[PDB]
């Protein structure tokens, strides 16, 4: 085999500044004809991979020349002279020489921006779902940065454990923030024993945790 | 114009079989080398198979994880390439692409290998109910397999919308939510309808949020 490695795993870049990401192959990718079998791709969510640079240093057609590739044997570098908004996504390297063809694990390039605390919203279960025997409580964190955040659920001030799940969006195209949804899942019978349902949010933009709550029965 | 269009994906039981097809057009087919590449969510691309041209005696090559189970083939008279998949495993679950590996890639076809049965979601409202910004949305709960799509007001409403990745619950069913923020003052001046689609179950639902 030939194993392809990359670093870093994540790279926040301020728009207009350079980006440099690295790739390594476990053996030389030079062919007898002087060609280096190394290729770079950018992949955005929901899209297929887009070729950026082929055979180590050749720009693919239509790719802005802000991108460039270089390499020495087994260590390769992709550079972006100045990052623009459409550049965000996961960058992969790949070798097409030794027949178990392989891709690297990817480097996620994100836009760096100033810290932004989330605004928080809490949604009680709908009566429509309650009449089916289950209750979902949803907590929304809107447009924060950076991505790290901690959401905790408290029912009548009792910190919950094991009964919630979260998901986060990719960076917003206009303000480079994230949003996050958390769902606390309860039986209808458990839901109706308790009064206060609270979502407690910790984030680097907050000096102290923010709590949004409601009382069952408004 | 160049077109590569995968089809044949869907839900299949472990140990079952599936044949993917990739219909192509817009380019001379005879001396184009083609590949299947797959991608599981949250992971990078994994090369699956490679097939050369008639001039090359249709030589084929395979990833270690699929040897002996998958067969890549092509019909030059129909400008189509195929991927026959036998003895499928849960670890074969992925989006499958056909591509020349370079500038041209199809849109992909999703293959889900699982013994779980198809189930369409219920769609519940996330009701708005004091900083000039209100939030509302739809919760799309308990469906299988992926994927689900959500739009608002039939696509007219996009600003402020956040449609989150699904989470896989311990029940083995998926659940996702879509939200939008709105000026609170206008609650009553706009109608908000989420349009939820789950093709594996033929579920298409529109839900008014109040």
């Amino acid at each position: 085999d030939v194993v392809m490695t990359q670093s870093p795993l994540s790279l926040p870049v301020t728009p207009g500044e350079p980006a440099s990401i690295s790739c390594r192959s476990s053996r030389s990718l030079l062919t007898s004809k002087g060609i280096t079998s190394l290729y770079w791709y950018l992949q955005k969510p929901g899209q297929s991979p887009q070729l950026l640079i082929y055979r180590m240093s050749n720009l693919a057609s239509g790719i802005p020349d802000r991108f460039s590739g270089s390499g020495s044997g087994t260590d390769f570098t992709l550079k972006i002279s100045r990052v623009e908004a459409e550049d965000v996504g996961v960058y992969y390297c790949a070798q097409f020489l030794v027949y178990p063809y392989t891709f690297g694990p990817g480097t996620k390039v994100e836009i760096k921006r100033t810290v932004a605390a989330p605004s928080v919203f809490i949604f009680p279960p709908s009566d429509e779902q309650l009449k089916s025997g289950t209750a979902s409580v949803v907590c929304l964190l809107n447009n924060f940065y950076p991505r790290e955040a901690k959401v905790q659920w408290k029912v009548d001030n009792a910190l919950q454990s094991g009964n919630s799940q979260e998901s986060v969006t990719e960076q917003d195209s206009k303000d480079s923030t994230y949003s996050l949804s958390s769902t606390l899942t309860l039986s209808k019978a458990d839901y109706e024993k308790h009064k206060v349902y609270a979502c407690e949010v910790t984030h680097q933009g907050l000096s102290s945790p923010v709590t949004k709550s409601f009382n069952r029965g408004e | 114009e160049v077109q590569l269009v995968e089809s044949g994906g869907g839900l299949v039981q472990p140990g079952g079989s599936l044949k993917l097809s990739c219909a192509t057009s817009g380019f001379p087919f005879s001396n184009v080398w083609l590949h299947w590449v797959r991608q599981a969510s949250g992971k990078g691309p994994e090369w699956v198979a490679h097939i050369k041209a008639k001039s090359d005696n249709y030589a084929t090559y395979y990833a270690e994880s699929v040897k002996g189970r998958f067969t890549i083939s092509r019909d030059d008279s129909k400008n189509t390439v195929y991927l026959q998949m036998n003895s499928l495993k849960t670890e074969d679950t992925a989006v499958y692409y056909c591509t020349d590996i370079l500038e041209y890639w199809g849109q992909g076809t999703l293959v889900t290998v699982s013994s779980a049965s198809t189930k369409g979601p219920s769609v519940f409202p996330l009701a708005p109910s004091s900083g000039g910004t209100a939030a509302l949305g739809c919760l799309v709960k308990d469906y299988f397999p992926e994927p689900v799509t959500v739009s608002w007001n039939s696509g007219a409403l996009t600003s402020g919308v956040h449609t989150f990745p699904a989470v896989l619950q311990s029940s083995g069913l998926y659940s996702l939510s879509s939200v939008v923020t709105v000026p609170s003052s206008s609650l009553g001046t706009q109608t908000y309808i989420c349009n939820v689609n789950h093709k594996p179950s033929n579920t298409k639902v529109d839900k008014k949020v109040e």
Binding site: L97 | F27, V32, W33, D100, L102, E103
Partner: peptide, 15 residues
């Protein structure tokens, strides 16, 4: 041993 993918690509076929 060798890399001939550009030369068998859809891009090349168009020339």
């Amino acid at each position: 041993f060798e890399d001939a993918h550009v030369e068998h690509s859809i891009s090349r076929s168009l020339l």
